[PDB]
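Re-run requested by the PI after the first attempt was lost when the workstation crashed. Everything re-entered from the original request form. Ligand of interest: zinc ion.
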Amino acid sequence: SPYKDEPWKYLDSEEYQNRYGSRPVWADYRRNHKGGIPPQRTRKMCIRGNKVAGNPCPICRDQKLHVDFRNVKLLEQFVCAHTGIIFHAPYTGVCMKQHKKLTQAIQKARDHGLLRYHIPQVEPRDLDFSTTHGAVSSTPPAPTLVSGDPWYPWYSWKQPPERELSRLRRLYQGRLREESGPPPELMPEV
Amino acid sequence: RKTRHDPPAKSKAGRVATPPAVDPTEFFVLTERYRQYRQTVRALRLEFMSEVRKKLHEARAGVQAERKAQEDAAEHR
Amino acid sequence: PYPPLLRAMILAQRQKYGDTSTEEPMLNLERARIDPWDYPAKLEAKTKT
Amino acid sequence: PMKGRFPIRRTLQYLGQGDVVFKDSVKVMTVNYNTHGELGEGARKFVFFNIPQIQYKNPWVQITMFKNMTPSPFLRFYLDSGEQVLVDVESKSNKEIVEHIRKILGKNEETLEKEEQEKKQLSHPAHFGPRKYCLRECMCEVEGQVPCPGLVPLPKEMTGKYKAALKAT
Amino acid sequence: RAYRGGHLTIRLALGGCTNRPFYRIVAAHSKCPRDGRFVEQLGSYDPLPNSHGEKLVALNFDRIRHWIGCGAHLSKPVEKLLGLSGFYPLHPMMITNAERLRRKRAREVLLASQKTD
Amino acid sequence: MARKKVRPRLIAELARRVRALREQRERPRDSQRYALDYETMMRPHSGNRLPMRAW
Amino acid sequence: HTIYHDISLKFKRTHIKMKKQPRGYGLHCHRAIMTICRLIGIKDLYAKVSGSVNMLNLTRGLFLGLSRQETHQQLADKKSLHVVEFREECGPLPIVVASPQGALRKDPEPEDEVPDITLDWEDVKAAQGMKRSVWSGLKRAAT
Amino acid sequence: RKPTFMDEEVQNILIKMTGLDLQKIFKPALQELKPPTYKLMTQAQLEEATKQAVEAAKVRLKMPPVLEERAPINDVLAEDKILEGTETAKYVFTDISYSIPHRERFIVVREPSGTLRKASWEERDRMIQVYFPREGRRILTPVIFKEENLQTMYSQDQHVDVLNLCVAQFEPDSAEYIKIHHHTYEDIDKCGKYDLLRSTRHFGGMAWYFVNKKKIDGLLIDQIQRDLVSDATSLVHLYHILHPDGQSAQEAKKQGAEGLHLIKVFAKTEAQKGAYIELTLQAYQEAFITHS
RNA sequence: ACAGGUUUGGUCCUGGCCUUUCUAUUAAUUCUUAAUAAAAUUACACAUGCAAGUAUCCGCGCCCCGGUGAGAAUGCCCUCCAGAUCUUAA
Ligand SMILES: [Mg+2]
Ligand SMILES: [Mg+2]
Ligand SMILES: [Mg+2]
Ligand SMILES: [Mg+2]
Ligand SMILES: [Mg+2]
Ligand SMILES: [Mg+2]
Ligand SMILES: [Mg+2]
Ligand SMILES: [Mg+2]
Ligand SMILES: [Mg+2]
Ligand SMILES: [Mg+2]
Ligand SMILES: [Zn+2]
Ligand SMILES: [Zn+2]
């Protein structure tokens, strides 16, 4: 591809109109299979390194066709103009590595307004809009909240009495541990 | 796990559990908070039991249930 | 005092029914008395009345 | 299907479109009709068409028919309390009997609507589980959260092997 | 299945994916397995934060209070999440763990100050 | 549950009576039940070891 | 692009059942019926051949069924009523395609509460979703 | 007694000014298709079908509620200093209950600093979308709503789709909702694309925005050029009702002019392109009087 | 099933088989890394390690988890629940 910057230029160029014309890129492509019904799984990847795996895909046979979310005329050939659904790989004839990328490009183009799709009429989320309820409005703060005190007074670290400390140390002999007073208020950083 | 009819292992047949180190100044201040929290959760459980009783009575003999119980028989007659 | 979220729930419950009473709600601890672990328990069978 | 006189009355759509739902008190419906005379034409058409419609939506209610026992066609509903509702039909058409039955003993529009609205509550959109009961299996598929490891590989800083290896040194 | 006893417990069933835990808050029997038969699912917990740096937690408070009034017990992480939410008071285990973390930070600062000079 | 081809098991019912009789006749007396070896801190009846804080 | 009405024809020993299809169901028929429709002009069609599969009888029965079609205009002429099309996507919009040219009869048609139609079990299964055949939902090539 | 968008005196006029165009209302979308149905009907039955279709299109043309910008949520329920750095991320708690509305759900957040506050709107709506998803909503902000993609979608004259997507995505009382609505209302009357909103369910909304922004020149000339005299004499009445204190509303009362002169008086009193409006009215007169 | 091959000098009809699609186990050939899911011959017999501990003694649980499908056409769904467990005065 000489363009490498504008995939839509090739679709309007002359060398495309004389080859494909008004017919989609997968018009004359026919996929071979084993019996009367083709497999539900198409070729995984048709280009391994530099070797082409025999009969190439309609997209992969001409390297000037770039899969991109900008050139919508190429992606429109893979979406039914009536049902608005994505053509599957057995329907198109492309390899799965390109079919997944085409699905991603179609979604990216629909997420950019470039490709049209159905937009249903949806009613609003809430039947009534009430901003007066206590869920979204401000609540009257607690007297312990406006004073700067914890929600429960026993949340703070209180020093136990020395008699209780001795009563605990008398019963927990042998397993005694180093004492530790109130922890710091603010934890320093590294 | 094991079963009631399985004998214990030889490595733990003569094994006794060992308690860890105990810090009293922390253990007491933790047990007091334990009690202050357990009384609060007990009160909250009692509040929830009262709410459940209220809802069960509203569902059994409620002023909304009796209206239907009467109007259905009236319309039936 | 009630916990913060439950306090907000209670303040928003009666507010919808037209109750402008800004009185502080408290949780009662009358029946919340519990015995310590050193309190010995009974060993007889409970009578289902 | 093809076999039978009216193959349409043996389809799921025909049996589902019949909106005749009794109350919880009706238990037995004894329909006694005749096979002669121009009068019992409505009762015969009712037995031929609307009996499966009612039986499909009332599976617990017994429906028993009788032919050539009394010269007057009638229906007899046996309620749970023991009250016997007798409905005589002599010249009523097919739809008239259905409307009369729905008027005398049936579920109202509001009665059906409240029940079908309460049944919707059991399936909750916020829960998680299999596709049979919940809309999502693993929370990875949520657009905002972290994707599933089988679909998107997790970075090395989040792998449990890297955390178990950095702690060894 | 039929059990000999057990008590209703509101716990967290760890049903998720490898290196991606996912706890479903559920009230179930105590003698049933973790991801086994349950009574009612109430909420969900996501341990790993999303792109917004938020750990999503779900609580069906109306059913939670109903089951607790019915006599369901709670577990340690359930109590921790309830204390973080504010439906229940903060757990003393969380308090003492915060205190231990502050003491560890203080010891780290002291060691960094004594190793610098 | 309740079938027509249910066999009336009698051994399962007789074992209940046997074990009920053996529970009362061979009931270990509280003396040797609470007997205690002050050397190994092991109960000779059940085989449990006492905790370390009670030593 | 499609045929007017569903045609269920029975030739000598070949039973052909062809159903009308929208713009999105293009020529999902036998490999010979598709070849014939591609030269006729039909772009969307579904057809099922049961019984015999003889090529000559298949062609003759297909042509007979396609020739015995009833145009909307002829139906409106023979019934003196408006042929109102109700597109499922266009909602309750009463689209009119054919008008009964001539004497417009003001007598309403007899509304039958139960249409005595001759359905087929092969269609009842498709309507109820009982078609568990693995060859039914296979992805095939394009037209 | 400030007239609101939900008032009958405004709604009955907006419906008449929008009008009923079934050929655009019941338009085949780009979804799955099914074979059509056919049935023989009389002329009376055809009229009944058309009136039922009108009754159904009323629901299609049901207007979306337009509100003001909601106040940001900033309220602290409790403060815990012991949670200064115990956690790295913040915990978002959402109350799940099918029997309560969404406007009354408690969406709280415990920050890692130790505070427990209420969540803002952008977080509350996101959590409501996560725990109760509806078709047409994206958890994250879609990229199409940026200036580039939005300008491209405007150039592709998809404003109706833009509005139907924004209404489904955002709340009608949020900030970005009003932002995008005013942005597309700027472009439609900048480029003169009022016809794209002729029979949609947003014509009332754009008219109610234009009567508040006092930009009626383009919409008025576009309504006059389409031979719509009733839709203009109804718009001038909406303007007079919404702005009672004004020379345009007082001169009309003191003159007692008819609906046809209500446009000329509005073009003379408070119109910017009054000469253009007068020229368009004269061109409409010299054509309609001669042709009918 | 959108079907195709196959009888006969040849045609039509009836008709069975196979091919065409999708999943799982084994065997042959080949083979480079990660992640995810799953590891499935055996109710044939087992060497060895671990899987039930807690606690100031009391007590509590000790096929609960987990494992398997030999027997049972066993069963699916629906009323009633004795009895057992948690909190209460109920
Ligand atoms: Mg064993
Ligand atoms: Mg796993
Ligand atoms: Mg054959
Ligand atoms: Mg032969
Ligand atoms: Mg192998
Ligand atoms: Mg080998
Ligand atoms: Mg023990
Ligand atoms: Mg098992
Ligand atoms: Mg047997
Ligand atoms: Mg019981
Ligand atoms: Zn390829
Ligand atoms: Zn996952």
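Saved to the shared folder this time. Residues 1-169 of chain D form one domain.
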